[PDB]
Curated annotation (Swiss-Prot), chain A:
Higher taxonomy: Eukaryota, Metazoa, Chordata, Craniata, Vertebrata
Organism, as annotated: Homo sapiens
Similarity comment: family membership: Belongs to the RIX1/PELP1 family.
Positions of short motif LXXLL motif 3: 36-40
Gene that this polypeptide is encoded by: PELP1
PTM (free text): Transiently sumoylated, preferentially conjugated to SUMO2 or SUMO3. Sumoylation causes nucleolar exclusion of PELP1 and promotes the recruitment of MDN1 to pre-60S particles. Desumoylation by SUMO isopeptidase SENP3 is needed to release both PELP1 and MDN1 from pre-ribosomes.
Protein's name in the database: Proline-, glutamic acid- and leucine-rich protein 1
Free-text domain note: The Glu-rich region mediates histones interaction. The Leu-Xaa-Xaa-Leu-Leu (LXXLL) motifs are required for the association with nuclear receptor ESR1.
Short sequence motif LXXLL motif 7: positions: 188-192
Short motif LXXLL motif 6, span: 181-185
Shown part of the complete sequence: 62 to 638 of 1130
Tissue and organ distribution: Widely expressed.
Location of the region described as Required for modulation of ESR1 transcriptional activity in the Swiss-Prot/TrEMBL record: 46-114
Motif LXXLL motif 11 per record, residues: 427-431
Subcellular location: Nucleus, Nucleolus; Nucleus, Nucleoplasm; Nucleus; Cytoplasm
From Swiss-Prot, chain B:
Complexes and interactors: Component of some MLL1/MLL complex, at least composed of the core components KMT2A/MLL1, ASH2L, HCFC1/HCF1, WDR5 and RBBP5, as well as the facultative components BACC1, CHD8, E2F6, HSP70, INO80C, KANSL1, LAS1L, MAX, MCRS1, MGA, KAT8/MOF, PELP1, PHF20, PRP31, RING2, RUVB1/TIP49A, RUVB2/TIP49B, SENP3, TAF1, TAF4, TAF6, TAF7, TAF9 and TEX10. Component of the 5FMC complex, at least composed of PELP1, LAS1L, TEX10, WDR18 and SENP3; the complex interacts with methylated CHTOP and ZNF148. Component of the PELP1 complex, composed of at least PELP1, TEX10 and WDR18.
Name by which UniProt lists this protein: Testis-expressed protein 10
Function per UniProt: Functions as a component of the Five Friends of Methylated CHTOP (5FMC) complex; the 5FMC complex is recruited to ZNF148 by methylated CHTOP, leading to desumoylation of ZNF148 and subsequent transactivation of ZNF148 target genes. Component of the PELP1 complex involved in the nucleolar steps of 28S rRNA maturation and the subsequent nucleoplasmic transit of the pre-60S ribosomal subunit.
TM regions (residue ranges): none
Family indicated by similarity: Belongs to the IPI1/TEX10 family.
Subcellular location field: Nucleus, Nucleoplasm; Cytoplasm; Nucleus, Nucleolus
UniProtKB/Swiss-Prot annotation, chain E:
Coiled-coil blocks: none
Domain of life from the UniProt record: Eukaryota
Residues annotated as transmembrane: none
Originating gene: WDR18
Protein name per the record: WD repeat-containing protein 18
Family indicated by similarity: Belongs to the WD repeat IPI3/WDR18 family.
Length: 481, 36, 358, 485, 376
């Protein structure tokens, strides 16, 4: 009854039965015993765990050095993750394992076959996460391993290597944090000089991978946990991001290796935008001083990447997500879409992406039209009354004739997620109007009423949850001062 | 808690209408919840 | 800009019995030929079928939206049907036979329940914008608020609010938007227009006029209440703060306000349907029919009214006459639109390529 | 440059720029490169190139599909073929030519795959049955025999794929479709009844096969009720609801404790989960027409939650999460006429199961204890209060106020509690806003304490809560700053 | 149930200087020892540090919340400090020196800008309940509405200007109350000319001009804007009802009822007011050396805690985790606050995902998926 094992394990876990060494010694029934071992580690009482944790850890270590097929190694690593996570809480077990068991686990994990790189890193991340102090002995070997695999072509391998390498300054802290970050920003300032040699064969395809790895490592470093206050060099990171997003297609030469560099251009801009997202996510609302640069960066990036799905459909979505994040973290102090050439350019770009335009597709450009609406609705709802009346009036002449036309071919509104966002933008316009431009309540209530008689369970649910909110702007409770 | 209005008075500027969600001519907004 | 039509019928019907013209053109979009639509007895069902109770007879004709001819379905009633309505979602059809309400069903065709609690003829029915409370006002001065939940699930059903304040028969009402948060506006011959509440069931306003009011309609934002009259005047009550529409010469039976609260459509007894612009109380159009107006309401043009080859998705069932699973429906409608976007037919392909390479 | 091919193809796709493809399809060492080039071309090609090369590309794919190559090549070939046959249904000439010449042979080629690469065969068969359902109608017997034997496969992916490909049989073929759909539904219901009778003799390796067959057939029924069909159908609601009420009738207090009793007691939650999934599919398909059968649906929840009740996660969390999800779906599809928590004996035996799941209660465990039920329950309660709000009695509203208001202001300024996740707090604030928006018109909501509670959320540490709380002060600024009287 | 405290300070300070006593029990929670406080000069920073100005002298003390003794850090200013206010989030500390509006930053410790438009002293300083606008008013009968976005990212050669200039009073301002919200809030400025005006911070318009009999010296509002408790220069605590709304823009108190809307029991000015959370007990200081709680629903006194000397600052808070716990070592030390005009943010990472840990069912499903994949 081997194949039926996972169902039995799941059904035993569901009832909460357990939570209230024999079959592992043979190559034939390693899985048969590993399943029960997974159950016992997952759902054991505190007494049984405090008794058998060391024995189970020794058994798990023994599975890792017996030349078992990769699936068994992955299962052992999955068990080890839970084992270490649960043992990191009990103090006596924590000290015992940190003193006389962890170095053996690290040595066994490092010494694995080159066919099982994934499981080794998966276990070493768990070892470095819950048991940080005791792994300082093998920091050099860990750095070499996480640095030799940081440019692997397989996306899963690269992601795992970057995740494992980002916590290197944690083992042993504040001095080791800034010291590492000033080296990543120095290496990235060098690869960009060997990748953009027009404004600032196979070697380029490796330099791009190296740059991607070293940028993902920095992005993970900026937006992860830490046990000590750090001093973030915001100005240097912003300078690097602005340098990366400076070279456009109009400066890359077209004589020689030019086509190869131009083909690689969008990936590097996407990496810079990911770094900007990490910076905004980490610093928080303290970036209002650089808000001018941040709000100027987005229209320029959108302008340098603008031209059947339209080309460059990944950069613009990333920029709109960046705008949504920026408005989300700041709030009413974002200062978006309110005055200035940059604000007007952002509004123009947003209004040319939500308006709807044989082998083809039905929902062409259905990802850009959703991100633009999800950004515009948040921007209007948060910093609403501080926007000039002209913008609100321009948006009133577009959304209202559009929500009553999508409910009566190659259009982005044939989806459901591209219509729920429109119905949310309508509510955002109603809720936060400019003081001198009253919103069109009469023409929006009818659209919401038409929405709840639809067929999609998403549109027909949001248009019914929005009528309750709209019933508070029409049936008041205190006099209008 | 209801409002009675003659049309001719409302046609001119004598009388005005003030109706609220949970009560007529009175806000009915005081709550009895107390943190204690 | 969205297209707006104005359904307008009559009571003599020389050639047609329904003339759906355009609001800002005057041109006749569709004309249906048949009998004579009775008062308060027209209601489009599901946006594809057009029912109309006959004047004084016991049956309800049914016209397709794109065919100028009566259908053979001739829904029958055991008495002199008075007024008709159809739920906004297009699932139930309600009649007004004598002093009783007949509840039907569209997906199957059965007759679920026969409610009987008024004491004189039923005069008007209406659903509360989302088919959750159908409210019927009789000729015995009663306005009752039924609930679509407790009426369907029964063994005898009872109303949720017996509003008895009028001293004369009820003539018209207009339920607002929302569910248990709307605001009904009844009116009777006792020269009063009252604005009730559905959540609690208490009076809120008792504006008293000087003539027997025969029609009430509020705009969607509940900023005005254009109560009709029996001398021709179409009053206007300001619910947020030269208020009299003048130019009619008989009872004002049918009233309805456009979408953006800026155009009125009055249906009187003097064979006339006007079009007032409600910011300066002036007339725009004076289309004249060939008999007293029975029904006239401004309606947003559906998709079926714009395509010359549209056909109904499902046929109309054989509507039963006596009292009582098996639902008939078209599947795959709850997911209409939910498709993998462009960045999802590519991410899956890229994941497949990466997995194959490794 | 073979390892770099996926990256180059993705980058070429990004720019939208769009002999060598067919040159590398005639070897073993270079098959992957040619498949990648074909995957790029057949997806991002202009109309003329596709209309000129569809037949050649399909013939090349059919040639690839019968070379005994490793299963990765078959996976890539089927992935390309799905797009090839999806894009060939929008061109009438190509559609007719393929449907009349190549599809009958392509079906046999797909059927002739080795047992090792069975998943690719199922994926390709779904591809040829979804977009081209009329030509694939002369081999319905073989298709049914293939899909029926794999409806009980233990692999979850294989089982799901076989169930997806087995519920499309009624659509296959040439009034006939409705009859086939009804007949298949009735046969599945009869088989489910027989299996249910087999598994519930009261009230060791044959039970584990009967359970697999029951689960497979129930999932096939669930996918049959909630899929796309051409002709109208006559869904029998009473029979399905009778079967569901029968499945949810046997509890843990009726199973015998002798013989194989423990085995029949261990399999109970899986059967109840299957019945609940079938009920959810029924509610999803029928829509708001189930109001007449509203009492059964309103009573089945406090009855299922009564047979599955108890730093430690509570037992039977999946069932008590599924029931709350079904309640949320019911309210969301019905609206103000859902009739939940509105009086009765079955409407107050459920609110107890809700207030006992959203309340918070040297050693092991985890910080987020019972963090699954405490989110589904909050979502269901918030939806119910938002929709069916002005119809609920004042006592329920007062109890909810007294239980919620001193809980949102204690979680902020004050170990191992369900409210240590960024979900159980956002849902709690959603419940607070729902209570404010739709109060019973005899107990005014506490608008003075809820504003302070929100004011402590927009300055929190998270981003989900610190965004929702700051987005609720724009809605709450309309209950205190009106524009009309 | 939550816990409500009542921070009180006296202008004599014989033994203590900031006594924190429980609301409904009257028992002490925390005391502090140091120099005398200053009117409108107390502000809790990030719920960890109790900054306070100094009466007459020009510097600002700093007490750690769980410490009875003064810290060795003193914010220094080039002139007599008048009022102080810390932003609600805790990122910015903003103080007023003579006519200047010196603005700091808690993270780095720099002095970003020195704004200067008032023509005389600044005697009130408040932050809108989302730290997006801060309203300043002074003894020049001017109330200005700045904006935290425009006054931070302004060029060094741009001399930032106020968003709104509210000049309707004819005598020095005395108190303000900016409600919840942001660009939708409402201010309740009050002057010495016997008026209490309620403005709008979105468009910048008057809404109400209640005219009392005696000079108003303190205004507070219910969190939902239902009552406007305006203090007096004689002892009475007048109460305006904003939800009755007779229906005009320039009211007068005597026509707006009397003897049933006036708290009485004080014998001198009341330069302190604050309403509790639920809105049922009001705490008011005075100049007759008494801090007493009222019963707003019934206009009755509850207790009459008597301090020593005039009462400068008095407010009702919602007791954070700091005061309830016994040690609570602060997360970050207070930096070196500069006194000269000017990257390097000092912060703790891993706080934007606090609690975003996988649920039990998620981990169980992942484990089952791993088992199933291994089986195949």
């Amino acid at each position: 009854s081997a194949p039926h094992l996972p169902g039995l394990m799941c059904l035993l876990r569901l009832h909460g039965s357990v939570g209230g060494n024999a079959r592992l010694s043979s190559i034939k029934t390693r899985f048969e015993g590993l399943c029960l071992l997974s159950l016992l580690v997952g759902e054991s009482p505190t007494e049984l765990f405090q008794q058998h944790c060391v024995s189970w850890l020794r058994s798990i270590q023994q599975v890792l050095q017996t030349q078992d097929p990769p699936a068994t190694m992955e299962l052992a690593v999955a068990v080890l993750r839970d084992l270490l996570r649960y043992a990191a809480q009990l103090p006596a077990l924590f000290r015992d394992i940190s003193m006389n068991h962890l170095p053996g686990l690290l040595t066994s994990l490092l010494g694995l076959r080159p066919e099982c790189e994934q499981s080794a890193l998966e276990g070493m991340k768990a070892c470095m996460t819950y048991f940080p102090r005791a792994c300082g002995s093998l920091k050099g070997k860990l750095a070499s391993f996480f640095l030799s695999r940081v440019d692997a072509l397989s996306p899963q391998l690269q992601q795992l290597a970057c995740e494992c390498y980002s916590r290197l300054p944690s083992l042993g802290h504040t001095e080791s944090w800034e010291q590492e970050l000033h080296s990543l920003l120095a290496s990235l300032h060098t690869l960009l000089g060997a990748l953009y040699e027009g404004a600032e064969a196979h070697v380029l395809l490796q330099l791009r991978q190296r740059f991607s790895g070293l940028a993902r490592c920095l992005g993970l470093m900026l937006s992860s946990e830490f046990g000590a206050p750090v001093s973030v060099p915001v100005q240097e990171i912003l300078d690097f991001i602005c340098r990366t997003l400076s070279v456009s297609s109009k400066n890359i030469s077209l004589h020689g290796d030019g086509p190869l560099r131009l083909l690689l251009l969008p990936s590097i801009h996407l990496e810079a935008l990911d770094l900007l997202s990490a910076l905004i996510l980490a610093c928080g609302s303290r970036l209002l001083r650089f808000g001018i640069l941040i709000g100027r960066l987005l229209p320029q990036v959108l302008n340098s990447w603008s031209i059947q799905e339209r080309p460059y459909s990944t950069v613009r979505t990333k920029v709109y997500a960046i705008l949504e994040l920026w408005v989300q973290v700041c709030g009413a102090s974002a200062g978006m879409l309110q005055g200035g050439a940059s604000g007007e350019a952002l509004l123009t770009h947003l209004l040319s992406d939500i308006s709807p335009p044989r082998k083809g597709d039905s929902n062409a450009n259905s990802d850009v039209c959703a991100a633009a609406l999800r950004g515009l609705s948040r921007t209007i709802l948060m910093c609403g009354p501080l926007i000039k009346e002209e913008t609100h009036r321009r948006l009133h002449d577009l959304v209202l004739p559009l929500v009553m036309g999508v409910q009566q071919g190659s259009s982005p509104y044939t989806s459901s997620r591209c219509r729920r966002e429109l119905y949310c933008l309508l509510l955002a316009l109603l809720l936060a109007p400019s003081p001198r431009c009253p919103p069109p309540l009469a023409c929006a209530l009818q659209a919401f009423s038409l929405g709840q008689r639809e067929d999609s369970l998403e549109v027909s649910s949001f248009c019914s949850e929005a009528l309750v909110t709209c019933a508070a702007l029409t049936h008041p409770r205190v006099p209008p001062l | 808690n209801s409002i009675f209005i003659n049309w001719k008075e409302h046609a001119n500027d004598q009388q005005h209408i003030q109706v609220y969600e949970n009560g007529g001519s009175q806000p009915n907004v005081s709550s009895q919840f107390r943190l204690r | 800009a969205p297209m707006e039509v104005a359904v307008c019928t009559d009571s003599a019907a020389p050639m047609w019995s329904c003339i759906v013209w355009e609001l800002h053109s005057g041109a006749n979009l569709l004309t249906y030929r048949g009998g004579q639509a009775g008062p308060r007895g027209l209601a489009l069902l599901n946006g594809e079928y057009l029912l109309a109770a006959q004047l004084g007879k016991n049956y309800i004709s049914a016209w397709e939206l794109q065919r100028k001819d009566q259908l053979q379905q001739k829904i029958m009633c055991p008495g002199p049907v008075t007024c008709l309505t159809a739920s906004p979602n297009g699932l139930y059809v309600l009649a007004g036979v004598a002093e009783s309400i007949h509840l039907w069903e569209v997906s199957t065709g059965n007759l679920l329940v026969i409610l009987s609690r008024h004491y004189q003829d039923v005069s008007c029915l209406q659903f509360t914008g989302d088919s959750s409370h159908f409210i019927s006002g009789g000729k015995d001065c009663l306005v009752l608020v039924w609930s679509l939940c407790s009426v369907l699930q029964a063994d005898i059903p009872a109303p949720r609010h017996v509003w008895s304040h009028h001293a004369l028969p009820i003539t018209d009402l207009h339920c607002g938007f929302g569910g248990p948060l709307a605001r009904v506006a009844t009116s009777s011959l006792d020269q009063t227009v009252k604005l009730w509440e559905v959540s609690s069931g208490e009076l809120l306003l008792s504006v008293l006029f000087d003539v027997s009011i025969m029609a009430v309609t509020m705009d969607l934002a509940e900023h005005h209440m254009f109560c009709g009259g029996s001398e021709g005047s179409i009053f206007q009550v300001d619910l947020f703060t030269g208020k009299v529409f003048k130019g009619h010469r008989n009872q004002v039976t049918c009233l309805s306000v456009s979408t953006d609260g800026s155009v009125l459509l009055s249906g009187s007894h003097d064979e006339t349907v006007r079009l007032w612009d409600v910011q300066s109380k002036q007339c725009i159009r004076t289309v004249a029919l060939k008999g007293p107006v029975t029904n006239a309401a401004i309606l947003l043009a559906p998709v079926s009214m714009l395509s010359s080859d549209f056909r109904p998705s499902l046929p109309l069932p054989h509507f039963n006459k006596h009292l009582l699973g098996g639902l008939t429906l078209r599947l795959g409608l709850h997911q209409q639109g939910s498709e993998p976007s462009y960045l999802d037919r590519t991410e899956q392909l890229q994941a497949v390529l990466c997995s194959t390479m490794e």
